Design an enzyme around this catalytic site. Structure first.
Site, PDB file in Angstrom:
ATOM      1  N   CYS B 163       1.057  -1.496   0.299  1.00 48.03           N
ATOM      2  CA  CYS B 163       0.215  -0.096   0.028  1.00 48.03           C
ATOM      3  C   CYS B 163       0.945   1.475  -0.161  1.00 48.03           C
ATOM      4  CB  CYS B 163      -0.967  -0.160   1.301  1.00 48.03           C
ATOM      5  SG  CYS B 163      -2.329   1.383   0.850  1.00 48.03           S
ATOM      6  N   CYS B 359      -7.010   5.004  -7.054  1.00 48.31           N
ATOM      7  CA  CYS B 359      -6.446   5.853  -5.841  1.00 48.31           C
ATOM      8  C   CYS B 359      -6.593   6.190  -6.247  1.00 48.31           C
ATOM      9  CB  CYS B 359      -4.862   4.998  -5.201  1.00 48.31           C
ATOM     10  SG  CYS B 359      -3.915   5.787  -3.621  1.00 48.31           S
TER      11      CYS B 359
END
Ligand SMILES: Cc1cc2nc3c(=O)[nH]c(=O)nc-3n(C[C@H](O)[C@H](O)[C@H](O)COP(=O)(O)OP(=O)(O)OC[C@H]3O[C@@H](n4cnc5c(N)ncnc54)[C@H](O)[C@@H]3O)c2cc1C
Ligand SMILES: Cc1cc2nc3c(=O)[nH]c(=O)nc-3n(C[C@H](O)[C@H](O)[C@H](O)COP(=O)(O)OP(=O)(O)OC[C@H]3O[C@@H](n4cnc5c(N)ncnc54)[C@H](O)[C@@H]3O)c2cc1C
Ligand SMILES: CCCCCCCCCCCCO[C@@H]1O[C@H](CO)[C@@H](O[C@H]2O[C@H](CO)[C@@H](O)[C@H](O)[C@H]2O)[C@H](O)[C@H]1O
Ligand SMILES: CCCCCCCCCCCCO[C@@H]1O[C@H](CO)[C@@H](O[C@H]2O[C@H](CO)[C@@H](O)[C@H](O)[C@H]2O)[C@H](O)[C@H]1O
Ligand SMILES: [Se]
Ligand SMILES: [Se]
Ligand SMILES: [Se]
Ligand SMILES: [Se]
Lengths: 421, 421
Positions: B163, B359
């Site tokens: 991440c 994202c």
């Protein structure tokens, strides 16, 4: 006829071709659908710049229409409309025959307004065009002539243009091709002239980092760039250019010699449509409501470049916003649905939806693409991208659209989004 | 019970919360739906980095769950599962109570594997975390302490992290906040440490120009960056870093003092799920087929970070690919549909569809976002964008998702695409 409406589609291009299939599919066997177009062949216009540099041939991007639409129950008349009588609902063709309609869908695209700049017509001088396959082929022929006898290059967009991408794309691939031929260094000067207020405005006030990336791109290729330009005339193989400031005042005049040239012209509405009294704005674009219906004639619809879309900004040199493929398809779907509704009592409530601009430009191994919506900033999506995926997508889409135009379209068109599911 | 299946959803997060609503909605009044989660509140995790710099407060991004799910007929147990017996189909809760299920949907998200790096736990030293609101609040508290007594900053991602975005985002907003406070020039050194093979790899082999733009971004802010790094230990307020080459060999070791720090840890599966024999891969991630069904237990499904997705590349320092919101929602929808199908004889054929990563990172007035699909290059979509529209979209989406989590979800979730129609 009464109870058996006759629907005519005028223009067999990006909006018109699919419109004919969608209309027939929606109306079925009890209604006559007729497609009327100036040429007997369909052409995939986003491929024209590549034809103009010789990377594509006409045979790859164009095919005769008749068999494909006729096998679907659509009547095809390969004739240009010269006159439209909206009162008697008669269309007069080039050969003098007349065609009656109950509904008319105007999909005539742009008139290329070379007359705005004396000497700028591809047949009048060295400034060529890549908007149609006829012109792109002519452009490549003249490109070969520059090859045999190198001289200055001028590529760009006229005042009032609304289609900027292809000018950038053409300029870049010419450069590319010139290198690949080891001929690049033979060119005295390579100049980019545009009516945009700045590089990468694109008629949409820029998108993502279009400004920075196109600027860098032009410099990278050794192309000198001028903005806020209008061409007043092409004459003696010279381009007369006036460059203005933010307030319209002149800040310089230039005279540029041209051996090979390509300027995107301003678009107007075609004469037979602009000729209909009270139908169009002063540019010859059809005034429609959100349902794609003429504001004047209830049985006239329009889609594609043929419609009017009001300006949202006013640039020092007149410029337009582009009308691109995805939005054109939405206009088409809305028109078809609303006509069908008319033919059944209802008032179709379908609209083209949110304004948007989507463009894909292939440079060879990779391309640039943008997506902008809605028209005014701040936008909900404002993206400029470059990469291989762009090239792949362009190549894929051309193949897809051309297949679709031969095989028929139901059809809620773009489910290119099944690549998600 | 027989003819009245009891479906349990384990974990009330990004996948679990919507899963509970969707399940109840799909199953109706004749089936019991129970949601079990460690906390009694939902948190919108993409907001945690802002909490970690003090731009958001817990109250804005978190709310108690019970009332919202109960008003929809869902039973809520605010208790952590400690043990799962897949044979007897019993879940043992923290307080020792046991819950039986006919179907189990595992949505437990990540275990934050601080144990991979001795001293890296937020409670063990200066290296903080922004993955949960508890930790982000702790992070901000320590940020204030750095403010009172300036010292070196180290932000980045551990070996095995998957991440990366939030590390970049946190690093940038800290910088931003430090300037806004006129405190930026008090910092001895601001260092970015990542297990990525290069800046902007993002665990997905880069997207658009993520490499160039994030590199420039870090330099712009005066942040010195190292890639191919793994932290071996945090100790005496020092971070011990080993940097490797393409072949794993060491090319240097560093010892970095840390006054304020934030490293994204590696994710593993939570213990109660990883504890189920034959259920998970060695990392504790649930092995599922394309229908989201456990490969071992036909009545166990999984979605979210909890599932295993095989690696597509092998980086010098171990790294993972992210599992992001849109894909998680597709996993959820598939699981719900396939369970419902089971409860009705059919074999649900629904899958999560094409792998993708989406994202959005907000920097204040504008943000960066990316979209990548599918997982391997060459991709069909490979876009990295920056602008105001990104900020607007993030702000909008947080507001939307949080409202949805309070009001209920039918629901084919993302029709954020009605902004087209
Ligand atoms: C060089 C170039 C590149 C482009 N690239 C893209 C791109 O990458 N992506 C994108 O979304 N858009 C692109 N566009 C913009 C756009 O989508 C096209 O211009 C598109 O073809 C317009 O669709 P249309 O149906 O309105 O007009 P057209 O496709 O031009 O079709 C209009 C048609 O009606 C006809 N016609 C005109 N007058 C008459 C008459 N009096 N009687 C009978 N028939 C008549 C024509 O001959 C023609 O077949 C590009 C445009 C150009 C010029
Ligand atoms: C800092 C950060 C920023 C991110 N930003 C984005 C973004 O901008 N866009 C995007 O698409 N994705 C983003 N993500 C990635 C991703 O989407 C999230 O991590 C998301 O919350 C994961 O969904 P999930 O349902 O799998 O796990 P979670 O949301 O963590 O939910 C898992 C839940 O189950 C629980 N639980 C764990 N063990 C037990 C147990 N034994 N018993 C009962 N309950 C248990 C938890 O407490 C929790 O409520 C971000 C992730 C992080 C860490
Ligand atoms: C679609 C309508 C738009 C106009 C039509 C076409 C315009 C011409 C294209 C000009 C682009 C040329 O310039 C090119 O762009 C990008 C700049 O970000 C660079 O590419 C850079 O970003 C890309 C991703 O987006 C990375 O994969 C790449 O490694 C990086 O270097 C290229 O190194 C540069 O050579
Ligand atoms: C979402 C996951 C990704 C990681 C999380 C966040 C990473 C941090 C963001 C770093 C970006 C900072 O750097 C910033 O980027 C772009 C570079 O193209 C620049 O912006 C440039 O392109 C944009 C459009 O895309 C234009 O509107 C702008 O006028 C132009 O200057 C900014 O001038 C620069 O300041
Ligand atoms: Se364009
Ligand atoms: Se376009
Ligand atoms: Se990410
Ligand atoms: Se993300």
């Amino acid at each position: 006829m009464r109870g058996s409406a006759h629907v005519v589609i005028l223009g067999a291009g990006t909006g018109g071709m699919p419109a004919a299939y969608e209309m027939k599919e929606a109306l079925g066997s009890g209604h006559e659908v007729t497609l009327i177009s100036a040429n007997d062949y369909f052409q995939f216009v986003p491929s024209n710049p590549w034809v103009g540099v010789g990377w594509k041939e006409r045979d790859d991007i164009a095919f005769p229409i008749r068999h494909y639409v006729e096998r679907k129950g659509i009547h095809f008349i390969a004739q240009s409309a010269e006159q439209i009588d909206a009162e008697a609902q008669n269309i007069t063709l080039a050969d003098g025959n007349t065609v009656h309609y109950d509904y008319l869908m105007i999909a005539t695209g742009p008139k290329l307004a070379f007359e705005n700049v004396p000497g700028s017509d591809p047949h009048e001088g060295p400034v060529q065009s890549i908007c149609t396959v006829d012109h792109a082929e002519r452009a490549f022929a003249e490109y070969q002539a520059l090859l045999r006898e190198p001289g200055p290059i001028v590529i760009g967009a006229m005042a009032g243009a609304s289609c900027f991408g292809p000018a950038y794309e053409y300029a870049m691939i010419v450069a590319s091709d010139l290198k690949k031929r080891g001929m690049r260094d033979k060119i005295p000067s390579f100049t980019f002239i545009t009516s945009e207020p700045y590089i990468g405005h694109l008629g949409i006030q820029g998108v993502g980092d279009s400004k920075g990336i196109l600027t860098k791109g032009l410099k990278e290729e050794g192309i000198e760039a001028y903005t806020n330009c209008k061409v007043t005339k092409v004459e003696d193989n010279k381009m007369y250019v006036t460059q203005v400031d933010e307030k319209g005042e002149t800040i310089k005049e230039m005279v540029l010699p041209v051996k090979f040239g390509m300027m995107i012209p301003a678009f107007k509405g075609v004469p037979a449509v602009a000729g209909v009294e009270g139908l169009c704005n002063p540019g010859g674009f059809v005034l429609v409501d959100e349902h794609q219906r003429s504001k004047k004639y209830a049985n006239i619809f329009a889609a594609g470049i043929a419609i009017a879309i009001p300006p949202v900004e006013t640039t020092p040199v007149p410029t337009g916003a582009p009308k691109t493929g995805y939005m054109i398809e939405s206009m088409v779907s809305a028109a078809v649905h609303n006509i069908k509704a008319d033919l059944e009592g209802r008032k179709g409530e379908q609209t083209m939806g949110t304004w948007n601009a989507v463009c894909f430009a292939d440079m060879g191994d990779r391309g640039a693409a943008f997506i902008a919506l809605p028209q005014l900033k701040p936008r909900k999506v404002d993206v400029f991208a470059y990469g291989r995926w762009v090239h792949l997508a362009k190549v894929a889409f051309e193949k897809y659209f051309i297949r679709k135009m031969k095989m028929g379209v139901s059809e809620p068109f773009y489910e290119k989004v099944l690549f998600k599911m």
